[PDB]
From Swiss-Prot:
This is Serine protease NS3. The modification N6-acetyllysine is found at residue 207. Residues 150-329 form the Helicase C-terminal domain. Acetylated by host KAT5. Acetylation modulates NS3 RNA-binding and unwinding activities and plays an important positive role for viral replication. It is a peripheral membrane protein. A motif (DEAH box) lies at residues 103-106. Forms a heterodimer with NS2B. Interacts with NS4B. Interacts with unphosphorylated RNA-directed RNA polymerase NS5; this interaction stimulates RNA-directed RNA polymerase NS5 guanylyltransferase activity. Interacts with non-structural protein 2A. Interacts with host SHFL; this interaction promotes NS3 degradation via a lysosome-dependent pathway. Interacts with host CEP63; this interaction disorganizes the centrosome and inhibits host innate immune response. The chain holds residues 1677 to 2115 of 3419 of the full protein. It is found in: Host cytoplasm; Host endoplasmic reticulum membrane. Residues 3-435 are lumenal.
Length: 435
């Protein structure tokens, strides 16, 4: 697609969907920003991560943009998706933007989903225009889209776990490989296997992305082992992508607990974004895409869209109106608008549990809605027996700040606080009352 100035008129929401590597960041985005500045539209640009934000700064070099992570007269702001949503939740002033530009608008994290819902509501009210940029917009059913250079697509058996024999083609490779895994724990086991095989490996996840991605730039490496976070703007100088074609789906069971279902097939959009990490250089043909499964569209019942409604139910708008989800995403949940609206006190705690507590949205809501205050950690230990958190098949214990050693057994079980080492470590600190 091509950008046209008429797309900036209020009530207009436009999806720009150039194929991967076609140049939406380096070419299209500055063109949009320049037009916005000329039309004196108060604008916000939304990047999925700080990595992409820094990339935009390079592309937008010389333009009066206020980077919110130098003049006072800038009318264009740039911040992260999560930063945008977080500010909407806080009782602080958010500008009445006339234009919203979201890069990587396919991002399926709750804060991004919420952002699109808020933005699309502002547009429909006639208060703004919006441009959503992504190579894989809603309705994407092509896993093998166009690329700057021909890609060698090959369906093969991809290791789901550490191996001691076979899969010679994996390690018998002299170039750089990006390997997409369904989880941190799984990637840790794959990475350990590769390291023992004498390969130089970098691991990427949401929590470690900003820091570890820097390693892909300052040293030689053979493999990058990454979760789906690398679908959201990360680029690598790689020759091969190995795609498990699998992911984990958070699912709210019984409205009492969250489990991680799967590993299960990824969406076509996800598959396309993973493959899209290579074949980006027109003058370098032959990049390989090794994939070991088909795709599936099962975002229905995915916890993230329910968590997005939890966020939007607590974002103020006008005369008690509540933002609906972005229309193509609306039927991924069944929750009623206003279902999760909290009182002022509980809402503050809700925000606090997410921000400072670093808890998943769903879990933060259970605690906050129960009227529990931030420093009250009794709930981390008083759950039913089947909520006992296990670590290497034994109950996870923690020495509390006033310890006394105690077993982790939360009143509400969200598997995401204990599915990998770093997550469990963070939750232990919280349960111990040290955050």
């Amino acid at each position: 697609m091509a950008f046209e100035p008429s797309m900036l008129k209020k009530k207009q929401l436009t999806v720009l969907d150039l194929h991967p590597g076609a140049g939406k960041t380096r070419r299209v985005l500055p063109e949009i920003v320049r037009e916005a500045i000329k039309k004196r539209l108060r604008t916000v640009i939304l990047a999925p991560t700080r990595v992409v934000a820094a990339e935009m700064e390079e592309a937008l070099r010389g333009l009066p943009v206020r980077y919110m992570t130098h003049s006072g007269t800038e009318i264009v702001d740039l911040m992260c998706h999560a930063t945008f949503t977080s500010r909407l939740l806080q009782p602080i002033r958010v500008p009445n933007y006339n234009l919203y530009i979201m890069d990587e608008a396919h991002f399926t994290d709750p804060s991004s989903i919420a952002a699109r819902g808020y933005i699309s509501t502002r547009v429909e009210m006639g208060e703004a225009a919006a441009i959503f940029m992504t190579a894989t917009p809603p309705g994407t059913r092509d896993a093998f889209p166009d690329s700057n250079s021909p890609i060698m697509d090959t369906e093969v058996e991809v290791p789901e776990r550490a191996w001691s024999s076979g899969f010679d083609w994996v390690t018998d490779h002299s170039g750089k490989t990006v390997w997409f895994v369904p989880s941190v724990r799984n990637g840790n086991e794959i990475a350990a296997c590769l390291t023992k095989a004498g390969k130089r490996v970098i691991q990427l996840s949401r929590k470690t992305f900003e820091t570890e991605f820097q390693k892909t730039k300052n040293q030689e490496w053979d493999f990058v082992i990454t979760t789906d976070i690398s679908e959201m703007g990360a680029n690598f100088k790689a020759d091969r992508v190995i795609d498990s074609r699998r992911c984990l789906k958070p699912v709210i069971l019984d409205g009492e607990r969250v489990i991680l279902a799967g590993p299960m097939p990824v969406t076509h959009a996800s598959a396309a974004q993973r493959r899209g990490r290579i074949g980006r250089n027109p003058n370098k043909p032959g990049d390989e895409y090794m994939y070991g499964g088909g795709c599936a569209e099962t975002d229905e019942g995915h916890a993230h869209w329910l968590e997005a409604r939890m966020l939007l139910d607590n974002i103020y708008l006008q005369d008690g109106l509540i933002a609906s989800l972005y229309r193509p995403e609306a039927d991924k949940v069944a929750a009623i608008e206003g279902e999760f609206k909290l009182r002022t006190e509980q809402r503050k705690t809700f925000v606090e549990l997410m921000k400072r507590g670093d808890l998943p949205v769903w879990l933060a809501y259970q605690v906050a809605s129960a009227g529990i205050t931030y420093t009250d950690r009794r709930w981390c230990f008083d759950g039913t027996t089947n909520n006992t958190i296990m670590e290497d098949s034994v109950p996870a214990e923690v020495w509390t700040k006033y310890g006394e050693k105690r077993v982790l057994k939360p009143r509400w079980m969200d598997a995401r606080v204990c599915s990998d080492h770093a997550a469990l470590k963070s939750f232990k600190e919280f349960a111990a009352g040290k955050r």
